[PDB]
């Protein structure tokens, strides 16, 4: 299940409570959640919201991708993923079974739980979503994680600019370090 990164107790919303230690954290990347006015991070722009600071491969972000784009990341890396239901209506047990509609090609899960499954594979294989980023996404990631505003250099054509952004991001900003890897 999910372990409190603080106490280590084992168990579509990312905000998780551990009742033992009262830690607030993200169930996708295990980074801490902060209530409004409680965030200590100097370069964070969100000071009046309940939030955490997530790596680019947290489900917090990747849940907003389409299933098709999540599949594309897996396909580009030749990681297999299920599309068909199991041998014998979403079975995933939620805290209120999920019971939602089970679309064709979504492996017998609802849309949200199928994306969670794809992200679980993406994370297991340490696939980097930045490899599919358009330049706008690379610029956003640069601002978010490197705290600088990117801009192309004189003499840099568009492919070179995009490649530079991608190279600096991947070299200097690790994927989530508390996300479980295989
Ligand atoms: C799926 O749930 C959400 C998705 C996007 C934004 C907000 C929510 C929620 O209100 C529930 C989950 C949640 C609660 C508090 C803080 C963050 C989140 C979250 O998952 O983003
Ligand atoms: Zn705990
Ligand atoms: Zn997260
Ligand atoms: Zn913050
Ligand atoms: Zn479901």
Residue numbers in the entry: 868 to 878, 884 to 960, 968 to 975, 985 to 1070
Copy out sentences from the published article reporting this entry, exactly as the authors wrote them.
The ubiquitin system, composed of ubiquitin-activating enzyme (E1), ubiquitin-conjugating enzyme (E2), and ubiquitin ligase (E3), regulates numerous cellular functions through the generation of various ubiquitin chains in a system referred to as the ubiquitin code. HOIP, as well as HOIL-1L, belongs to the RBR-type E3 family, and the family E3s reportedly generate polyubiquitin chains through a RING-HECT-hybrid reaction. The linear ubiquitin chain functions as a scaffold to recruit other IκB kinase (IKK) molecules, and the recruited IKK molecules are then activated by a trans-phosphorylation mechanism, leading to the activation of the NF-κB signaling pathway.
We identified a thiol-reactive, α,β-unsaturated carbonyl-containing chemical compound, named HOIPIN-1 from HOIP inhibitor-1, as a LUBAC inhibitor. In the presence of HOIPIN-1, the molecular mass of the truncated HOIP increased by 263. HOIPINs are covalently attached to the catalytic Cys885 of HOIP via Michael addition. The benzoate moiety of HOIPINs is the key element for binding to HOIP. The aromatic ring of the methoxyphenyl moiety of HOIPIN-1 and the 2,6-difluorophenyl moiety of HOIPIN-8 stack on the carboxyl group of the benzoate moiety and the guanidino group of Arg935, respectively. Indeed, a structural analysis clearly indicated that not only the RING2 domain but also the unique residues in the LDD domain, such as Arg935 and Asp936, contribute to the binding-specificity of HOIPINs to LUBAC.
